[model samples]
Target: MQYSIEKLKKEENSLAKDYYIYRLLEKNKISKKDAQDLNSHIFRYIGKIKSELEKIIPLKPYINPKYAKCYTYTANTILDANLTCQSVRLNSLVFIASLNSKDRTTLAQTFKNQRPDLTNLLLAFNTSDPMSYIVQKEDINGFFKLYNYSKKYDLDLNTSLVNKLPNHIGFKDFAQNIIIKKENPKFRHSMLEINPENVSEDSAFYLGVNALTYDKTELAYDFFKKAAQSFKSQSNKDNAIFWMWLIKNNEEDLKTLSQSSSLNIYSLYAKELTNTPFPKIESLNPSKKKNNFNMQDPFAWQKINKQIRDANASQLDVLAKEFDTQETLPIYAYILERKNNFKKHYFIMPYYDNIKDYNKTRQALILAIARQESRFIPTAISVSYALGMMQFMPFLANHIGEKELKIPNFDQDFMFKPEIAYYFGNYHLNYLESRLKSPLFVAYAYNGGIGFTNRMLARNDMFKTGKFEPFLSMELVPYQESRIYGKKVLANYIVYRHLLNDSIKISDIFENLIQN
Candidate 1:
C-alpha cells in the first residue's frame, strides 16, 4: 500500500500495521535488527513472516507480498489462531472454502483434533460443534457471530471463562443468559470463589433476576442490593432496588425505588405496589422570551448547564426562579434534579406545537420518546454519536434523511432542529410500528434496533405468560442499555399518554407484551 512508515505506525488498525511490517520485511526494506526496534507485537509478527518467506525460495527475502497468498505457513496452533483469522489466505484454509460445503465440512473434520481455528470449525461443523470448539478455545473473537447460535453451549460456565472474558456489556448479557439457565448457580458460586472484583454489576443483575427462580431467598437479596449500590445509571439502580425490594419485602427500598426521578418501569412498579400516585409530570408553561441560540448545539447547552451543575441548593433555587421562561425550563429542571428535588411542575414538556399534526397516540409516543431521548433538547448528542432530541445516530440520520425524507447529501446536523428531528422520528416510528405493536416493544426497537427486538421477542423464554411473564422477560433482554432504556421510555410513554388525557397505566402497557 506504500504507506509512510510514520503514518503506518500511527494507523489505528493493527492489521494494517502488521501488513505494512510484513511488506517491508518481505521487500528487505528494513533490517532484521531494525525491525527489532518496532513494537514487541509487531516484532513478533515480523519474525513469523520472515520464517514463512525463508521456507519458499531459500533467499533472505524470497516470498514477498505476491508470494504470501501461496504459502500455508505453520498450521494448527493457538499461537497463530488470532493471526490466521486476520489473514486466513496465509494458512491455506481459504482455498478449501472453494470446495462444496459438504466437502469443506468433511475436510475440516479431518483436522478437528489438531485445534483448527474458528473459521475452520465454523465452516466445517456448521453450527453446534464449532460453537463448542469456540468455547473450548475461549475464542471470544467470533463469539458475537456465534452468540445466537450458542445462546441456547458447550463450555462449563465458570470463573476461568469469566476471568478470561473482557469486562464488556455483551459478556455481562452472556453471563445473564447463563444465570437464566441452570449454570447461574455454578457461575455465582464460582464468581464468589474467585475474586469479587472481576464480577460486574451487569453480571450480578442477572443473578438477581434468577434469584427467585432458585430457592435460596436469604442469599439472593445481596446480589440485587449489591447491584443497586454498584450500578451507575438511575434506571439500573431502580431496577436493582425493585428486585431487591422483591426479596426484602421492605418499605425502605420500596420508598426509595418509588422516589426515582427516572420514572422507570421498576420505580412505577414500586409505586403501583404501594398504591401511590406516580410523581407525574405537571405541564411547565411560562411566557416565551427571545433567546437567540442554536437549540441543536449540545456543546453550548452543556457549557450553560455545566455552569449550574455545581451550583448549591440555594444557588440552584435562585437560577430556577430566574430561568423560569419556556426556553430555560430544562435548566430549571436540571437544577431541581441536581439538588435531588422531585417536582412535577419543574419537569417541562417543550415544543408540542412543532409536532402538532400527529394524532394524540403518536403525539404522546413522540413526546415520550423525545423526553427519554434528549429531554427535548434540540442539540443533544449522546456519546455514541446519536444526535438531536430524537438521538438519531450520525449514519442513521444521514441514511434515513436521504432515503425517507429525500434530503440529498444529508447532513446529520439537520437533526439538531426539532422540526426535522421530530419529522424523522415520526417516520421512524411509522417503520417501527409496522413491525411492533406494543409501546414497550417499539421502545426497545427504537433504543436498540428492530432486528434485536425481533430476536429478543422470538425467544421462548421472554414475555411468556406467567407470574413474572413480561417483567422477568424484560430483564432477560441481553442488551443492558436497550433493556433499561425501553423501561424508561415505556414509563415515559405511560406518563405522556396520561398527560394527553388518554389515561394509560404502566401495568396496563406491560401486561399485553406476553401473548398467552
Candidate 2:
C-alpha cells in the first residue's frame, strides 16, 4: 500500500499535527496498526520524494553539470508527485536539502511560504549551516520554537550556538546558570524563592550550588542537607554531602561521603580529597534474567541476537529495528558485555588502523568510549540527538568534517556509519590528547568539549601541590552528563585494556592519570 502525503493532514489528532509519530517510529513505540497506516502513506511519500530528490541532486559533485540536467527533472517530478502541505513532507524535504543543499534559500522560502505557522520547523532543516544567528536576529518566536523542539527531542545543538544564546530563555538558562555562577560567584541564586517542600532533591541540590556561589552559606548548607537526606540514589546523596563539605570544609562529612559504596565520580572525588586510595575494579555480574519486552513478533529479536553472536559487522544497521527503544538497549548490551561478546570484537578490531595508527594506547580507549556512548550500537542516537556509535552531535560532526577532515559534504547520515564515527572520534581524541594526556581528562573533553574541560581544569581547587588530579577535576565538571560520562569512559578504558591483555590495576591507572 502506498502512503499519501494528503492523508497526513486529516485534521484531528493526525500524525501530521505532532512529530511524535516519527519519534515513536524511531523508538519502536508505535502499534502495528499505526505503523501500517504510516508506512502506507506518510512514509511512502517521504521515501519516494527523498529518493527522487537524491537521484536528481546527487549529493556528490555539488557543481554537477547534471544538476542543471536533473534539477528541472527532479523539480518537475516533485511537482508531478503532487505532495501536500503536511508537516512530514516539509520535514522530509528539509532532510533532503540539508545534506544535498544546492539552493537552500529556495527550499527555506518554500517552507516559509507554505507553513508560516510552523516557522520553528526550519531549525531542523539546515544541517549544513547553523541558523542561530537568523533565529536570534530575525525570529525570536522561531528561536523559542526550536528551543522546545530540541528539548522535546533531546537534540543537542552546536555548543557555540548554545553558548551564544541569552540567559533566562528556555534551555539557555541551564547553560547560563553555570556560566553566571562561575563568573559572578556573588550573584543571587535562582530557585531560592521556592519552598523546599515543593522542590525535587535534584533541583534542591543545584539550588544549593547556586546558593554557595553567592556565599549564602547557611541557606546552601540547609539545601544540601535536605538534598542529602531526601535523594533516593546514594551517589546523589554523596554529591550533596560533597557540596556541604565544599562550603563548610567539614572533615567528618568528607570522610562519611568518601566511604560510600557507590564508586562514582563524586565518591572518587571525596576519597581523593581526603587522600584515600582509588577503588579497585570489581567484576560485574549482571542479572541473567531477561527483561519483558513489548515484542510484536516473538521471534524478531533472535535474528539480531544471532547476528550479534556471529559477529556480523554489516548487521549493525538492521538491528536498529530489533532494539528500537533505549529502554531495552542497556539490558541486552549488559548481557552481551557480561558475556564479553562485544559484537564479536567488531568494535575493537575494525578501527584499529585508524585509531591505533594515531595512538596505539588509545585503541582500547576508543572501544571503551564506543561501549559507553552507544553500547556498540552503530546507529544509536541519544536524546540530545547525538548520533552513531560514538554519539557525535551534528554540529560537532559538521565542524570536524570541515575543519579537521576537510570534507564539507559531511551530513547527519555520516554519523550513522561506524567507520566514519570511529575515524572522526579518533581524530577528536588525538587532538585532545596533545593537550591533556590522561584518559579521564580526554574523556571529559570528549563528552563536554575542549572549552568546558579546559575551564574545569583551570579552576584553582582542581589542582593540588601544582599537579592536576583526575578525580578532583572530574567532580568539578559542572555538567552532570560530562561528570558521569568521564567516569564511565575511564572505567571502560580500564576494562578494555584488561580485556586486550595490556592489564593495569585500577589503582595504578588512577595514580598515573592523576599526575598527567
Candidate 3:
C-alpha cells in the first residue's frame, strides 16, 4: 500500500508540477477505488509524520503534512493537541504556513486567544521569516525540537544539512527559510476582472485600488460604489467599499456610505476626515468616545467591539514605535505626522539589528514593502492563502523549493516553524532579488509571477524598438492582480526610499535589487 512517487505522478496533471494535489486527488486523479487502495499509503505516511510531530514537548504538529487531511482533520489535530497539551501554547506558530484561507483564520484566532504568546504572532504569521522571528525571539530550542519529535515518531529530521545558530540569535536571513515559502502573492486582484460576478471582497478592493492608480477617478468611484453596494452581501466587501470611499475625495459618498452599512469600517477614514459619529451595531445607535471597536476581530472589527479596541490600545507602544521610526525617515515623517499610528507590533521592530551589514537605504527600501505587505507583521495571513510576512503562495514557492533542504513529504507546517519561516523568507528574497534587478521589482514579482514581469520587460523593450504601436506592456499580463501589484509595489518602493532620504537611484533600485 505504499504510495509510489510514480503513482503520485500518474496522478499529477504534469510530473514537474509540484503542488498539493488536493482536488486532483479527491476529484480529478484518484477514483474511489484508486483512493481506497492509495488511502493506506497516504495515511501511513501522514500518520507516521503526525505521530512524530506529537513528540515535540508542547505537542506541536508539523504544519506541512497537515494539508493532506481531506476535511476537518487538519484543524482537528491542532485542537486535539491543544486540549491535552501541557507545554506552552502548542506552538501555534506552525499555523502561519496554512495557505488555505479558512485554516489560516481559524488558527490565527486560536493563537490570539490561547497564547502565552504575544501580539507579534499575528504579524509574524504574515512575514517572510515568521519562524525565524519565532526562533530568534522566542524560545524554540531548535535541535531539541527536531530530535525528540523526529525520533519519537520515526521521522527523519536530518534530511537537510543543518546550519549552527547563535544561542539567542534574534534573527537570520529571512529569504533562506523553506517553511514559510507557501504564501500567496499580494496581487490576486486579477481575480476580480476575471470573475466580477463572484469576485471576493479582497478582489474588489484590489480593483478599486487599480482604478484609483490608473487615474480613473470616475471608474474608481464606480468600483468603490459597487463595493459599498456589495456590502449587503458581504461585510468584507463593504469594508473595502468604505475604504475606497475614504481614500478618494468623495465626501458626500463617504457620508452616505458610512450611515448605510452596518459594517462600520468607514469610521476609520470617516473619523479621520469627516466628523461622522460611529454607530454601535449592538445598540444600532451612535457610540460614545470609548467606542468598543476591535481591530483584531477575525469576522468584524468594524463596530467598535470592546475586544478590538482593547487589542489596539494594548499594542499602542508598537504603533508609537513605528510612527517614531517613520519620522526619522524623510518621506515617512509626514505620513507618521498625520496618519493614525496603527502599525502592527511585530512589524515595528528594528530589522536593521537582524540585518547589520545592510545600509540604511537598503533596510528602508526592504521595510517599506514588507511594511505595506504584512505591516511588518511576520505571521500575517492573506485571504488568498499566502503565508508569512512576505506572503508567498505555494505555487511560486514550489517553483523554487529548497533543493538544499532534504525535507521529504514536507508540508505547510514547516512554513509556520520559526527557523523554517525565516530561512525560506530570506532565501526567496534573495531569489527575487537575483532575478528582477530591483527589490521593488522582486517584491512585485513575488506578488505577480516572475514570468509576467519578464514578459512586461520584453514588451517595454518592444515599444522602444517602435515595432508595436500603442502596445501596453502589461496588457498581456492577463491577471489584473499582477499588473496592479507590480505598480503598487513600485509606488511603495518610491515612498520608502523617499522616507529613508537615501540617494539610492531609482534605476539602481530597479537594477541592484533584482538578480539580472
Clashes of each: 1, 7, 66
Q: TM-score of each candidate?
A: 0.59, 0.45, 0.33
Model 2 Cα lDDT, one tens digit per residue, 100-135: 343344444666765663433444354433344444
Stretches of candidate 2 off by over 4 Å are: 1-200, 215-219, 245-261, 269-331, 335-361, 383-386, 393-420, 436-441, 448-516
Lowest-sum lDDT 10-residue window in model 1? 73-82
- Model 3, CA-based lDDT: 0.41
- Model 2 clash pairs are 2-40, 3-40, 3-41, 4-41, 154-383, 154-384, 156-384
lDDT of each: 0.65, 0.55, 0.41
Residue by residue across 1-516, what tens digits does model 1's lDDT show? Answer: 265556656544343245455556656776544554455534234455546444432444456675464354333332233433424542433343333456446545545565455345446345435555566666655544455444443435455665666454566756666654445354445443223345547666666665655545554577677778888778788888887676668889999987787666788777887788867565556676635544544445656665676777788777767766767666556666666554343335676687776777898889888878877777775545477889897678877887766887666678878788888999899889878889888899999899988887787767888755676777767776787678777877777777777876667777778777
Best by lDDT: 1
lDDT of 3 at 445: 69
lDDT value, residue 66 of candidate 2: 30
- Top-scoring candidate (TM-score): 1
Ranking of models by lDDT: 1, 2, 3
